[PDB]
């Protein structure tokens, strides 16, 4: 259903709201009308390493099979998790980079429009001059 | 690198190594010579009945192939009375019973 | 419709 | 794009880690030991010849290497990341300034082109007045 | 979890407007439209579209759908019937873009 606060939104309370704002600026339904407050190089050098280790574990997992394999698969799990950590470090950085790209594109577009109209105007002027050079 | 030969131990090849002729390792070659489909000479070592007819053939009489585990589930010496049993079996009259084959 | 009954809309619209 | 390719390549690395062992753990061959190799009952054994099995081992062993080289090419093809963020923020601000300036320049160019178009218009009404005062 | 807060209650309620069937259930009523209370509440819930209240909005649709309904209550069954077909055309594309 709908929240209970809706029962405090009558036209009379809306008529009493401005003076309650001016009075409170200097507990009730009019407080229900007031909105609530707001609550209170890099990793690329390691990724390679991790990658190189992953294969090295896979070989082990191949070379075991016996009941020893279990122990090995544990280590493998840890490696994969590490990979995920570094990618987490790539989540916000790439976002900012994307913003950069967008802005640059905007700049280029801006100049392109003007350039188009410019060349058109030039052509027009030349054409008229030609006609002039044929009469006198 | 990390997790690279970290369990420093000689996890040797499994002691019952299948790379070895395990039949010859565990000495199961004699029973193999006894129960295999092919004899050591070369002829077919089959001709074994699907039932235990050879061992009832070691006995004598007609034996049509027709409990024990339940006894194994619930396992000291039983009782017996000699005079009462001898008095019980002392009754069999010489008259023939009903119809049952002597096959 | 599950996040409302499992969140706070059910209880907030039920205690009154 | 650049962030998704890493996750795709990783999931492919795991799917190859499993699929590479799946074929060998299901289809393989026996060994002659010292007497014979093939058993009389080969209904559920589906023994494959050692040629296609060896070639399959080579292919499954090659695909992981190809995908790994693709991972190396991708981590080397990613844009230049930095350990700090003041560079990125600075770039963003600069791009904003360039956007404002190029917008203003666009405005000026549009104005000038408008003026020229007004002039050549003026010429055209001159001609129209000419022929109008002429033929009739 | 402990007792809720009016901020989270109003937040989850305005975020519930992203669902199409829920808005359909809210509009196909007969009691909440007799008195000018639910309309003034929906018009009151327009503070989430402005910062810093917009920093907690997870679904961008619920806000704009709210502005549509507040845009429609100013000026019965038929129009209420009219909106969901169109929004239905819009949904799946975004769903494709999400995951």
Number of H helices, E strands in chain D: 3, 0
H helix intervals, B8-101: 22-25, 29-35, 53-57, 68-73, 82-89
Q: Contact at 8 Å (CB) between A70 and B20? A: no
Q: Contact at 8 Å (CB) between A76 and D68? A: no
Chain A with chain C: Cβ pairs closer than 8 A: 8
Name the resolution in angstroms. Answer: 5.8
Q: Which of A106, A102, A46 is nearest to A79 (CA)?
A: A46
Please answer yes or no on whether A9 and E40 come within 8 Å at the CB atom.
yes
Q: Residue A44: which residues within 8 A CB-CB, separation 6 or more?
A: D75, D78, D81
Q: Does D3 touch chain A (CB under 8 A)?
A: yes
How far apart are the C-alpha atoms of D102 and B93, rounded to whole Å?
A: 133
Backbone angles phi, psi at B38, to 5 degrees: -110, 130
- Which of A10, A11, A36 has its CB closest to that of E7? A36
| Tokens representing residue D95 in the block | 């791009």
Backbone angles phi, psi at D17, to 5 degrees: -60, -35
Location of structure tokens 């200097």:
A26
Q: Does E40 touch chain A (CB under 8 A)?
A: yes
| Tokens representing residue A70 in the block | 């279990």
Q: Contact at 8 Å (CB) between E9 and A3? A: yes
Please answer yes or no on whether A68 and B4 come within 8 Å at the CB atom.
no
CA-to-CA dists, residue D45 to A1, B21, D37, angstroms: 63, 21, 13
Q: Residue D96: which residues within 8 A CB-CB, separation 6 or more?
A: A103
Please answer yes or no on whether A2 and E38 come within 8 Å at the CB atom.
yes
The number of C-alpha atoms within 13 Å of A66 and in the hemisphere containing its C-beta is 17
| Tokens representing residue A69 in the block | 């394999």
Q: In chain E, which residues are followed by a C-to-N distance beyond 2.5 Å, i.e. a gap? A: 75
How far apart are the C-alpha atoms of D20 and D13, rounded to whole Å?
A: 10
* Helical axes D2-26 vs A44-64, angle rounded to 10°: 10
- Which of E5, E37, E52 has its CB closest to that of A10? E37
Distance (Å) from the alpha carbon of D136 to chain A's nearest alpha carbon:
23
How far apart are the C-alpha atoms of D81 and D6, rounded to whole Å?
A: 15
Residues in chain C with CB shorter than 8 Å from the CB of E9 are: 8-9, 12
- Where does residue D91 rank: exposed (0-12), middle (13-18), buried (19+ CB within 10 A)? middle
How far apart are the C-alpha atoms of A20 and E15, rounded to whole Å?
A: 29
Q: Contact at 8 Å (CB) between D60 and D19? A: yes
How far apart are the C-alpha atoms of A120 and D116, rounded to whole Å?
A: 12
Cα radius of gyration rounded to whole Å, chain E? 14
Residues in chain D with CB shorter than 8 Å from the CB of A103 are: 92, 95-96, 99
Give the burial string for B46-58 (b: 16+ CB within 10 Å, else e): eeeeeeeeeeeee
Q: Which of A77, A95, A88 is nearest to A47 (CA)?
A: A88
Q: How were these coordinates obtained?
A: cryo-EM
Residues in chain C with CB shorter than 8 Å from the CB of E4 are: 8, 11-12
CA-to-CA dists, residue B36 to B29, B62, B80, D11, D36, angstroms: 10, 29, 47, 50, 14
- What are the DSSP calls for E21-63, one per residue? HHHHHHHS-SSTTSSTTHHHHHHHGGGGGSTTGGGG---HHHH
Q: Which of E72, E5, E15 is nearest to E48 (CA)?
A: E15
How far apart are the C-alpha atoms of A43 and D5, rounded to whole Å?
A: 17
| Tokens representing residue A45 in the block | 């050098």
Distance (Å) from the alpha carbon of B21 to chain A's nearest alpha carbon:
18
Note the residue count of chain C. Answer: 16
Q: 3-state class of B81 per DSSP?
A: coil
Q: 3-state class of B17 per DSSP?
A: coil
Cα radius of gyration rounded to whole Å, chain B? 29
Residues in chain A with CB shorter than 8 Å from the CB of B10 are: none
| Chain E residue closest in CA terms to A2 | E13
How far apart are the C-alpha atoms of B21 and B17, rounded to whole Å?
A: 9
Residue D132 belongs to what H/E stretch?
A: helix D86-134
Q: 3-state class of B57 per DSSP?
A: helix
Please identify among residues 6-35 of chain E the ones whose CB lies closer than 8 Å to any CB of chain C.
8-9, 12-13, 16, 19, 21-22
How far apart are the C-alpha atoms of D63 and D9, rounded to whole Å?
A: 12
- Which of A49, A52, A68 has its CB closest to that of B11? A68
How far apart are the C-alpha atoms of A124 and B74, rounded to whole Å?
A: 115
* Helical axes A44-64 vs D50-77, angle rounded to 10°: 170
Distance (Å) from the alpha carbon of E21 to chain A's nearest alpha carbon:
13
The separation between CA B24 and the C-alpha centre of its own chain, rounded to angstroms, equals 24
Location of structure tokens 């090295």:
A56
CA-to-CA dists, residue C7 to A124, B90, D128, E53, angstroms: 68, 91, 77, 20
Please answer yes or no on whether E13 and C9 come within 8 Å at the CB atom.
yes
How many other CB atoms are found less than 10 A from the CB of residue B77?
A: 4
């Amino acid at each position: 259903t709908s929240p209970s606060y809706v029962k405090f939104f009558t036209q009379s309370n809306l008529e009493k709201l401005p003076k309650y704002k001016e009075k409170k600026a200097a507990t009730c339904a009019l407080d229900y009308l007031i909105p609530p407050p707001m609550p209170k190089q890099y990793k690329i050098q390691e990724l390679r390493k991790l990658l190189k280790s992953l294969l090295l574990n896979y070989l082990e997992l191949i070379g075991v099979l016996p009941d020893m394999y279990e122990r090995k698969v544990e280590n493998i799990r840890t490696i994969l998790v590490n990979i995920h950590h570094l990618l987490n470090e790539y989540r916000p950085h790439q976002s900012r980079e994307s913003l950069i790209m967008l802005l640059e594109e905007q700049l280029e577009y801006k100049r392109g429009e003007i350039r188009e109209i410019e060349q058109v105007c030039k052509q027009v002027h030349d054409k008229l001059t030609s006609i002039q050079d044929t009469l006198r | 690198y990390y997790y690279y030969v970290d369990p420093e131990t000689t996890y040797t090849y499994q002691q019952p190594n299948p790379l070895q002729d395990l039949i010859s390792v565990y000495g199961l070659d004699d029973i193999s010579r006894q129960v295999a489909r092919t004899n050591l000479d070369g002829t077919k070592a089959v001709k074994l009945r699907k039932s235990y007819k050879n061992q009832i053939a070691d006995l004598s009489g007609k034996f049509s192939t027709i409990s024990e585990q339940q006894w194994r589930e619930q396992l000291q010496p039983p009782n017996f009375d000699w005079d009462l049993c001898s008095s019980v079996l002392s009754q069999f009259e010489r008259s023939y019973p009903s119809e049952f084959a002597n096959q | 419709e599950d996040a409302l009954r499992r969140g706070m809309l059910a209880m907030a619209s039920l205690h009154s | 794009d650049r962030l998704t390719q890493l996750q795709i390549c990783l999931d492919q690395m795991t799917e190859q880690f499993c699929a590479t062992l799946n074929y060998i753990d299901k289809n393989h061959g026996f060994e002659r030991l010292t007497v014979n190799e093939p058993q009389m009952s080969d209904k559920h054994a589906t023994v494959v010849p050692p040629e296609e099995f060896s070639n399959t081992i080579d292919e499954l062993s090659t695909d992981i290497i190809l995908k790994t080289r693709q991972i190396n090419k991708l981590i080397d093809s990613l844009p230049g990341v930095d350990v700090s963020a003041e560079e990125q923020l600075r770039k963003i601000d600069m791009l904003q300034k360039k956007l404002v300036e190029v917008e203003d320049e666009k405005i000026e160019a549009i104005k000038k082109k408008e003026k020229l178009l007004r002039h050549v218009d003026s010429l055209i009404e001159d001609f129209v007045d000419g022929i109008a005062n002429s033929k009739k | 979890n402990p007792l809720p807060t009016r901020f989270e209650v109003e937040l989850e309620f305005i975020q519930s407007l992203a669902n199409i069937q829920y808005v359909t259930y809210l509009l196909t009523q007969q009691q909440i439209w007799k008195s000018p209370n639910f309309k003034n509440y929906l018009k009151y819930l327009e503070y989430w579209c402005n910062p810093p209240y917009s920093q907690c909005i997870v679904y961008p649709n619920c806000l704009f759908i709210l502005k549509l309904l507040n845009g429609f209550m100013e000026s019965x069954x038929x129009x209420x019937x009219x909106x969901x077909x169109x929004x239905x055309x819009x949904x799946x594309x975004x769903x494709x873009x999400x995951x």
